[PDB]
Design a protein around this ligand. Structure first.
Ligand SMILES: [Mg+2]
Lengths: 1340, 49, 586
DNA sequence: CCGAGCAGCTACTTGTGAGCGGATA
DNA sequence: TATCCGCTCACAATGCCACACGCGCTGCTCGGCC
């Protein structure tokens, strides 16, 4: 079974890996993200409930007045997406929130609140994305890319090498919340520990530790262990465990139980440890000079004198030892210090701790946070408790707590948003351990540590940023509001939140309009992951670590799709089968592998769980029953390829395309190309321009059937039905009986979009590709959009290409083209440019768009209409006034009598200024559409009336089609009900029943049914009239433009630009070039059969830049064309359908054990002829990214046709007419015309305008400006001689306000001699320095 | 292009370039640490004369 | 000054103002407020705070952001002060004093011009018209064609048939300056005589763009007009392409031929063992060219011809000697191009890149500069022509896979397997295992590369009245590689043979090599490791060109403070130059 | 009261060099 | 008290080109010898 569009023209496929997971929705990421944004979710989960329940409710300053939040709702969009595009307003929706003001009387803290005010209030509008994941803010379609940043949680960086130049590696722990204040623990070059709060002063960690009501003994018991020294008869015996002395030398005779164990000066070895553990002894004998090196743990108080003998973190001395012995403390707890197990880091941080108690710690940390402002202890504590433990300024999200609990090896993964003392204790212990040697650092180059945020999360963040401002506003407004004086509507304003969301969608480092030039760019732009913007690094401050791609990027992000230039690696494209995890990570599907069989199920593994299991090779030769043909298999354990067994593996790749992007999967024979060429090709395919007539690519990849369908460029069938009405503008389909709704249903209508300007000055047009009466299925394509062909992506065009030098015209990378290409309307494209004319309201009278243009003849005004706008279809090549804008300059109050008089008699209209808008000098073409928007109040000109009347006629045509269908059904029903009165029906109801429903007899049932049907009829008519009136009021409603404008006029100039020497064209393997010189058809080389070649590339570009696959593709292309040729030879000569069917079967049954297995005997024996007709142009061939056709398959496919097997054919010269030796290869290659047309690059200026800040010539191509003589150009010129040349290039041609005029006057008078003068910008610098307190002066 | 005017400041002020040169001119000329000169400049302390 | 302050009437009641205007206005506001407070006898603390605020305002006007608090005026962006209008890459020095935009300039995408001579270049018609409008006006006023400037301007706008000849006359000997966007050395800007061409692209000579480092994949270059007699004479005298044949860095010529011409000449001179007309005799190179173009003989075949060479004696004499040589028809045909001074031993070679470069070097050394330009031009012409007539083409069957590559790969696999067995036996540790795997894979890669080379050289046997006469391989990819045209040894090794070893992020070498090539299919993980290793080298240049530009700017700033101002200093001290022999031999 | 212009609603760069305490003999 | 060491702050980080876009709303304060 195959789809209906596949029955039109099924594409031959190769490959031997039967895929198990189909291609998912290419735009599922942003669609699912925005679906998670706007929806009623309980438990305050992602979207909008979290932002509300986190901020709301709000309470006054103990005023018993609370504002509760119940729910929210999104109203219907006030304008459709098409209406928003044609008008320019945003495709947004209202946000009505039902709030609850519960204010209660005084003298009752928890008194039962009464006089509840439950009210729905509107607060700003939010932009809704279309079915394609695009936002329409101001006419254009803006897409929000997903941002890759650091996952909230904890990280452990290892600063080595140059860091501190001391040869000591430091380890710094960073706690980064999702929203709040950071935390950073680190070590000095010494063994000191310090902490900082958001890049503040480096201060010790014991102070912030004791800030949370922590004493010294508690900290010491938490961090370090306890060594017990007992006061025995003498020698102060000590407990011993043979594992704590591992690695130390014996400074004394370690002997116990009357038996020597370790001698003085013997390092305790592992055998010594085993010997000391065999007897299991604890108490030994230790000298007096050994205790002096240790240090007491806790503060031991005296009971005789009531004083302190010794404090913590103070090394013991002999006098202190005698004191503590005479005090009576038998058990003395000391620290266990060992550089290999427990490095002393808290002891030093303790002895550098200036403050001891909790209160001075708080005031010191307050002084460290805020300069000065010395509070008391209770006033300072507010800051320390509000910065790290308040849920309003610390917002560790669910993924943050998850990563935090996973990093510290904790079972539970849930928690709160605020921190806790035990968490800080644990992270400090982890830092100490990772310094001691136990534990490894967490690299930043790991997808498990890099979190991806979608448009929904950024929108929620900005919503919260606005909500905190509105919260402060409503809190300061609630300071005076009392009971029974205000509804919960006036205290809330739309301003902050609405503006916040609007600016987040309008102007940001992520808010950009989509590059609407081809569906491939549309898909690769929405699946684009950036590292810039807020919360991400900058390209100017990025190291060689974020640019490099990790082995953890396998299947989660493409490694070959990257914009080469200023940001390499920072901007990537998501993988094909990559999905967004619930927590916000990159998940990749994998097939679960059991002992012997690989079950056809999928598990979406995360980034952290990759190293735990092992993944099997994607293209590993596998046997039946989910087995491997070989015992050993190529796998990867932890980002390292290796060789494993057939049973140790646990997971397999789902397919072979998940490693590349969707923009890279369309590169045929990608496995035969280098990484650099593949990157340059996949990037250039993004810049394809839609040709005038699309055409199927021969050497395809199979994925093309998805991009052109999964996107929103083509007309997809929402309900499969029968074609009713085919037209270039609209397509009307009749829904099948089953798919049709059982009530108030009808037929579907798709309004195709005609030639309209895109976001890159390209034409976007949809062409119907269905026939009348042809049944279509649901999801099938109906109309091919730009660069599409029967539901298949088709960017460029296939051409006959040879590879041989031709008189150096393909010198380095230049492309040679025959006149046959440009003559056949092949690469000619359409460019649509928008020109705006605004009638701004100024003083002295507003502007007019009339047609009375004085100081000019009729030739320049012959293209203007009665209203003052150029006609629809009026060509223009030079500067010509296409809209009659005039503005009054002096006295207003020009009487209408004298106004019409000036148009007939009298003098000219004075107060005009001739400020009309004309087309710039250099652009040509024919205007195809004019747009006008009039503010409510200004007189609508008759052209706007005509435009709205035309669109109303269109909408009325649709509504009348619907109404006539419903009325035909209803009249069939009335015929079915009055059949009882048959003779009068057939007599006086054949012609006149359509207007004479009035009948009557036999009341009981006939009157009942007739009345029911008449009621249905009048209700239907009234409903359709209501729909028509609503549409009229909608399309006639004037849109707002700006404060101080009357009307805005827009025109669209469409120019057809053909290929010419100077254009940039490229294949699909990074072989770019420029058309060197168009050639006559006779001069181009031709084969011994007479078919001339179209494109003659340079074969020398293949070896160095290793893109060989194209050649293969070329070969395959030839084979494809060959088959088509045969079909043409079978179509021109009238052949029976049996021979054609057998030939197509033999072609599709190529001997490669492919997974296609299509049969021709199942077709209708009629669509076979249509399919063959759709194959005479060639045989479309699909090719997986890595399972492509081998050499032998292409060889046998070529030998199927009459083409030579070697792929190289003898070629004759077009000029000399002789045979080229060394038979050149030739085939059919798919090429692309890049969006770098020469007509927008060539530019020149003799003498134009000059800047006002300094008298220097402008540049650019839009304005008539020259080029910039760069500083390196000045260096190269002064490296030469040319002193006069530099002096003229600097001031005489650019800056001399009085020299360039003199030089021009001399040149036009035949005088080639210059005058130095003085550069004006130098005087500008003199004035600027003089504007300062610095005096600059020229001497004699 | 060349005619200039002026502003008669009621209070004579310091030139930030000569005060934030690192080393600043006044910081070396007046043999006074830049911290104290900045303290005097922003009116949070006094200097005797 | 007021007009020096940017303030232009924007669309509507709003005006596009400067950042200095807000500064000056705030300064004036606070000054007026302070003057008011001083008259009302305000409290000491109030006037103190007012003086502090006025000080803040004036120091922000002087240099905003230096005090510590970068105030914003609009858009929440740092405001522009007077110091900001001088410093950085946006002050007057970097933007409006050193490099300024010039008039009479243009810009366009480049394209290959293979017919124009070395000293000239192409130029679009509309471009040339727009550049030389004043010269056209002057020449129109000269003849009895245009009385005033308005008539000439209208005729130029209309572009009558009487103005094209004027444009051809004004660009008869008026050179222009071609300039690449990134300028590195003196050759970043050159002078060329323009010839008018109907089109929108700039036709460029193929032998000069190599100096420009300008490929034809869409590079746009700029054009400038000298506009002065001194200027035109300087551009014709110094900045001309003919006057710059040796790079200022090294004495090696910068006019070295590119890949196309050298491939054509290599194919022309690469002789086979048997072809059409092997063993015959030819009188002169003209008869050889006649016999070749007639098709009665091949292009490369050992033939005994007679050459008439010329040798330069001690004085300016050119002695002539006629002798019979045994050379290929290609060399004999190419001999009609070289001037008389050069001997025949320079053509009787395979004529690779190094060979043709040293040939041009010897030509410039013996014959000077005047004939060297036309010699190189004729070299390029003949190379293009014969490379076109040759039919060089790369194909799938052209790249051959070594038949014994499979057994070598299997032997290396057995070796790494027994090494892993030894490691599992506990005898060898992990580091020595890694080293013994890396070196074994390197030896296997060297063996398979030597095999691929000696295989690409063989299977070229042709019967010349005998049984087998194995010769130099005529494979197209080998012709493009061995001749040094475009392909190197390592490139073709990665192409046909195994790619070898790759790298990991830190810089080490992975223990699993890429046992596949490009012609054969590449595994998914192999291609992943390949692109991982290649992205590093790709981003390398993209990040490093910035440091290169900064270094160039620093170096030129340290430079340009000295010129040759004396003819002799009159000292005797110097440096003792010695050939360094550290490390290797020398 | 009127009009005109202007204000509130931060942290993966790293390295280099210079300056300012600061603590150790 | 001199003097090396550690912490803090100023300054730098190609070049070109091409396209597109932007600085709002309510609120506050100053404007004026005919
Ligand atoms: Mg280039």
């Amino acid at each position: 079974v195959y789809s209906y569009t596949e029955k039109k023209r099924i594409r031959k496929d190769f490959g031997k890996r039967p895929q198990v997971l189909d291609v998912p929705y290419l735009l599922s990421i942003q669609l699912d993200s925005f679906q998670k944004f706007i929806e009623q979710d309980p438990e305050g989960q992602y979207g909008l409930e979290a932002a509300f329940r986190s901020v709301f409710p709000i309470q006054s300053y103990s005023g018993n007045s609370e504002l509760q939040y119940v729910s929210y709702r999104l109203g219907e969009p006030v304008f459709d997406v098409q209406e928003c595009q044609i008008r320019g307003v945003t495709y947004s929706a209202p946000l009505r929130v039902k709030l609850r003001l519960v204010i209660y009387e005084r003298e009752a803290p928890e008194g039962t609140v009464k006089d509840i005010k439950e009210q729905e209030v509107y607060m700003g509008e939010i932009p809704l994305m279309t079915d394609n994941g695009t936002f329409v803010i101001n006419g254009t379609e803006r897409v929000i890319v997903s941002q890759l940043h650091r996952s909230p949680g904890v990280f452990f960086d290892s600063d080595k090498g140059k860091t501190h130049s001391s040869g000591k590696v430091l380890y710094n722990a960073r706690i980064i919340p999702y929203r709040g204040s950071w935390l950073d623990f680190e070590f000095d070059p010494k063994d000191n520990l310090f902490v900082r709060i958001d890049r503040r002063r480096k201060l010790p960690a014991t102070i912030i530790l004791r800030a949370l009501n922590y004493t010294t003994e508690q900290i010491l018991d938490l961090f370090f262990e306890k060594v017990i020294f007992e006061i025995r008869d003498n020698k102060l015996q000590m407990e011993l465990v043979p594992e704590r002395l591992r690695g130390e030398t014996a400074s004394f005779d370690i002997e116990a139980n009357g038996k020597v164990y370790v001698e003085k000066g013997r390092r305790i070895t592992a055998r010594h440890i085993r010997q000391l553990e065999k007897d299991d002894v604890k108490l030994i004998e230790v000298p007096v000079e050994y205790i002096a090196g240790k240090v007491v743990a806790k503060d031991y108080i005296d009971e005789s004198t009531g004083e302190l003998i010794c404090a913590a973190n103070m090394e013991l001395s002999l006098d202190l030892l005698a004191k503590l012995s005479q005090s009576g403390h038998k058990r003395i707890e000391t620290l266990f210090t060992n550089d290999l197990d427990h490095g002393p880091y808290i002891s030093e941080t303790l002895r550098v701790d200036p403050t001891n108690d909790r209160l001075s710690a708080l005031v010191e940390i307050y002084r460290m946070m805020r300069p000065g402002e010395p509070p008391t202890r209770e006033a300072a504590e507010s800051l320390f408790e509000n910065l790290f433990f308040s849920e309003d300024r610390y917002d560790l999200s669910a993924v943050g707590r998850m990563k935090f609990n996973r990093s510290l090896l904790r079972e539970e993964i849930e928690g709160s948003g605020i921190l806790s003392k035990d968490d800080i204790i644990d992270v400090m212990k982890k830092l100490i351990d990772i310094r001691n040697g136990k534990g490894e650092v967490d690299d930043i180059d790991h997808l498990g540590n890099r979190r991806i945020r979608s448009v929904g999360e950024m929108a929620e963040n900005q919503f919260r940023v606005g909500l905190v401002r509105v919260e402060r506003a409503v809190k300061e407004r609630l300071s005076l509001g009392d009971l029974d004086t205000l509804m919960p509507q006036d205290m809330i304003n739309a301003k902050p939140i609405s503006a916040a969301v609007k600016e987040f969608f309008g102007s940001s480092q992520l808010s950009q309009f989509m590059d609407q030039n081809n569906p491939l760019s549309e898909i690769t732009h929405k699946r684009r992951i950036s590292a810039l913007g807020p919360g991400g690094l900058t390209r100017e401050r990025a190291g060689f670590e974020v640019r490099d791609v990790h082995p953890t990027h396998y299947g989660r992000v493409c490694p070959i799709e990257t914009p080469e230039g200023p940001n390499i690696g920072l901007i990537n494209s998501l993988s094909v089968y990559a999905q967004t995890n619930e927590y916000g990570f990159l998940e990749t599907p994998y097939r679960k592998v059991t002992d012997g069989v690989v079950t056809d199920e999928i598990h979406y593994l995360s980034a952290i769980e990759e190293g735990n299991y092992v993944i099997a090779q994607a293209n590993s030769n596998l046997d039946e029953e989910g087995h491997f043909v070989e015992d050993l298999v190529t796998c990867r354990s932890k980002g390292e390829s290796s060789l494993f067994s057939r049973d140790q593996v646990d997971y397999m790749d789902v397919s072979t395309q998940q490693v590349v992007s969707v923009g890279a999967s369309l590169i045929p024979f990608l496995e035969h190309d280098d990484a650099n060429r593949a990157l340059m090709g996949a990037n250039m395919q993004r810049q394809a321009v839609p040709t005038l007539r699309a055409d199927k690519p021969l050497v395809g990849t199979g994925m093309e059937r998805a991009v052109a369908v999964d996107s929103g460029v083509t007309a997809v069938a929402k309900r499969g039905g029968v074609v009713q009405y085919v037209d270039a503008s609209r397509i009307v389909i009749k829904v099948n009986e089953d798919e049709m709704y059982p009530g108030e249903a009808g037929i579907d209508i798709y309004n195709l979009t005609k030639y309209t300007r895109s976001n890159q000055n390209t034409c976007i047009n949809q062409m119907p590709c269905v026939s009348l009466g042809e049944p279509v299925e649901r999801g099938d394509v109906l109309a091919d959009g730009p660069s599409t062909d029967l539901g298949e992506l088709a960017l460029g065009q296939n051409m006959r290409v040879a590879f041989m030098p031709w008189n150096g015209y393909n010198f380095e990378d230049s492309i040679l083209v025959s006149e046959r290409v440009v003559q056949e309307d092949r690469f000619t494209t359409i460019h649509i440019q928008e020109l705006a004319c605004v009638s701004r309201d100024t003083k002295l009278g507003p502007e007019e768009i009339t047609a009375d243009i004085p100081n000019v003849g009729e030739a320049a005004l012959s293209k203007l209409d009665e209203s003052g706008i150029v006609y629809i279809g009026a060509e223009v090549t030079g500067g010509d006034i296409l809209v009659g804008k005039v503005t009054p300059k002096g006295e207003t109050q020009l009487t209408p009598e004298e106004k019409l008089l000036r148009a007939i008699f009298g003098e000219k209209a004075s107060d005009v200024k001739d400020s009309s808008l004309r087309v710039p000098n250099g652009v040509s073409g024919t205007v195809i559409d004019v747009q006008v928007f009039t503010r409510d109040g200004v007189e609508k000109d008759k052209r706007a009336l005509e435009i709205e009347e035309m669109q109303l006629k269109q909408a009325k045509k649709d509504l009348s089609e619907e109404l006539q269908i419903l009325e035909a059904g209803l009249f069939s029903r009335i015929r079915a009900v009055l059949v009882a009165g048959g003779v009068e029906a057939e007599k006086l109801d054949k012609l006149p029943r359509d207007r004479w429903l009035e009948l009557g007899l036999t009341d009981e049932e006939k009157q009942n049914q007739l009345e029911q049907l008449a009621e249905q009829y009048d209700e239907l008519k009234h409903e359709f009239e209501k729909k028509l009136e609503a549409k009229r009021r909608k399309i006639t409603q004037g849109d707002d433009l700006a404060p101080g404008v009357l009307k805005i006029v827009k025109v669209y100039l469409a120019v057809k630009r053909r290929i010419q020497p100077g254009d940039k064209m490229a294949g699909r393997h990074g072989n770019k070039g420029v058309i060197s010189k168009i050639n006559p058809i006779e001069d181009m080389p031709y084969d011994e059969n007479g078919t001339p070649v179209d494109i003659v590339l340079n074969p020398l570009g293949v070896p160095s830049r290793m893109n060989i696959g194209q050649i293969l593709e070329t070969h395959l292309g030839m084979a494809a064309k060959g088959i088509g040729d045969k079909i043409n030879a079978m179509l021109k000569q009238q052949q029976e359908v049996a021979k054609l069917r057998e030939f197509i079967q033999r072609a599709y049954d190529l001997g490669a054990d492919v997974r296609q297995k299509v049969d021709l005997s199942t077709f209708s024996d009629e669509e076979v002829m249509r399919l063959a007709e759709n194959l005479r142009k060639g045989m479309p061939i699909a090719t997986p990214v890595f399972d492509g056709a081998k050499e032998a398959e292409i060889k046998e496919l070529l030998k199927l046709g009459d083409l030579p097997t070697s792929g190289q054919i003898r070629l004759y010269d077009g000029r000399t007419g002789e045979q080229f030796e060394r038979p050149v290869t030739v085939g059919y290659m798919y090429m692309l015309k890049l969006n770098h047309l020469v007509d927008d690059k060539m530019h020149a200026r003799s003498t134009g305008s000059y800047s006002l800040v300094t008298q220097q010539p402008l540049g650019g191509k839009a304005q008539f400006g020259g080029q910039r003589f760069g500083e390196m150009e000045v260096w190269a010129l002064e490296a030469y001689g040319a002193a006069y040349t530099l002096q003229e290039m600097l001031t005489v041609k650019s800056d001399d306000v009085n020299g360039r005029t003199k030089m021009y006057k001399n040149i036009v008078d035949g005088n080639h001699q210059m005058e130095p003068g003085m550069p004006e910008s130098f005087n500008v610098l003199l004035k600027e320095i003089r504007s300062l307190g610095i005096n600059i002066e020229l001497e004699d | 292009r060349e005619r200039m005017g002026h502003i008669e400041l009621a209070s004579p002020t310091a030139h930030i370039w000569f005060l934030k040169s690192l080393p600043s001119r006044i910081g070396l000329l007046l043999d006074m640490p830049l911290r104290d000169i900045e303290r005097v400049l922003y009116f949070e302390s006094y200097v005797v004369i | 000054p007021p007009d020096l302050r940017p303030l232009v009437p924007l669309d509507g009641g709003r005006f596009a103002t400067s950042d200095l205007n807000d500064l000056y206005r705030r300064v004036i506001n606070r000054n007026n407020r302070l003057k008011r407070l001083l008259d009302l006898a305000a409290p000491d603390i109030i006037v103190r705070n007012e003086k502090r605020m006025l000080q803040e305002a004036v120091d922000a006007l002087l240099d905003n952001g230096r005090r510590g608090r970068a105030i914003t005026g609009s858009n929440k962006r740092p405001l522009k002060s007077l110091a900001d209008m001088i410093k950085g890459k946006q002050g007057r020095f970097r933007q409006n004093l050193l490099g300024k935009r010039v008039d009479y300039s243009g810009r366009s995408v480049i394209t290959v011009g293979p017919y124009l001579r070395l000293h000239q270049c192409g130029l679009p018609k509309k471009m040339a018209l727009e550049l030389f409008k004043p010269f056209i006006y002057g020449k129109l006023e000269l003849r009895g064609l245009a009385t005033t400037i308005k008539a000439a301007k209208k005729m130029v706008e209309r572009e009558e048939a009487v103005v094209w000849d004027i444009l051809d006359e004004v660009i008869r000997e008026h050179p222009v300056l071609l300039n690449r966007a990134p300028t590195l050395h003196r050759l970043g800007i050159q002078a060329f005589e323009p010839v008018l061409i109907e089109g929108k692209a700039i036709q460029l000579h193929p032998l000069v763009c190599a100096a420009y480092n300008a490929d034809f994949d869409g590079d746009q270059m700029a054009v400038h007009v000298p506009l002065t007699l001194e200027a035109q004479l300087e551009a014709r005298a110094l900045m001309m392409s003919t006057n710059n044949i040796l790079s200022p860095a090294n004495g090696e010529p910068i006019i070295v031929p590119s890949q196309d011409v050298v491939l054509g000449l290599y194919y022309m001179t690469r002789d086979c063992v048997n072809a059409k007309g092997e063993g015959m005799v030819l009188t002169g190179p003209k008869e050889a060219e006649r016999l070749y173009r007639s098709g009665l003989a091949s292009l490369h075949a050992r033939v005994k011809v007679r050459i008439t060479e010329y040798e330069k004696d001690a004085n300016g004499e050119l002695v002539a000697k006629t002798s019979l040589k045994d050379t290929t028809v290609g060399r004999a045909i190419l001999w009609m191009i070289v001037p008389k001074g050069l001997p025949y031993s320079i053509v009787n070679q395979a004529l690779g890149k190094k060979a043709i470069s040293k040939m041009l070097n010897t030509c410039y050394r013996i014959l000077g500069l005047k004939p060297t330009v036309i010699f190189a031009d004729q070299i390029m012409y003949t190379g293009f022509a014969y490379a076109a007539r040759s039919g060089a083409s790369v194909g799938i069957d052209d790249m051959v896979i070594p038949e014994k590559k499979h057994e070598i790969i299997s032997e290396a696999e057995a070796e790494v397997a027994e090494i892993q067995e030894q490691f599992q036996s506990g005898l060898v540790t992990a580091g020595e295992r890694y080293n013994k795997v890396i070196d074994i894979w390197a030896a296997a890669n060297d063996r398979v590369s030597k095999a691929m080379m000696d295989n690409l050289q063989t299977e070229t046997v042709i019967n010349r009245d005998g049984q087998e006469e194995k010769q130099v391989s005529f494979n197209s990819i080998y012709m493009m590689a061995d001749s040094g045209a475009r392909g190197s040894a390592a490139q073709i090794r990665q192409l046909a043979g195994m790619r070898g070893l790759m790298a990991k992020p830190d810089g080490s070498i992975i223990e699993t090599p890429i046992t596949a090539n490009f012609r054969e299919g590449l595994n998914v993980l192999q291609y992943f490791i390949s692109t991982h290793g290649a992205r590093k080298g790709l981003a390398d240049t993209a990040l490093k060109t910035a440091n290169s530009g900064y270094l160039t700017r620093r170096l030129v700033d340290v430079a340009q403070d000295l010129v040759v101002t004396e003819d002799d200093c009159g000292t005797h001290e110097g440096i003792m130059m010695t050939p360094v022999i550290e490390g290797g031999d020398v």
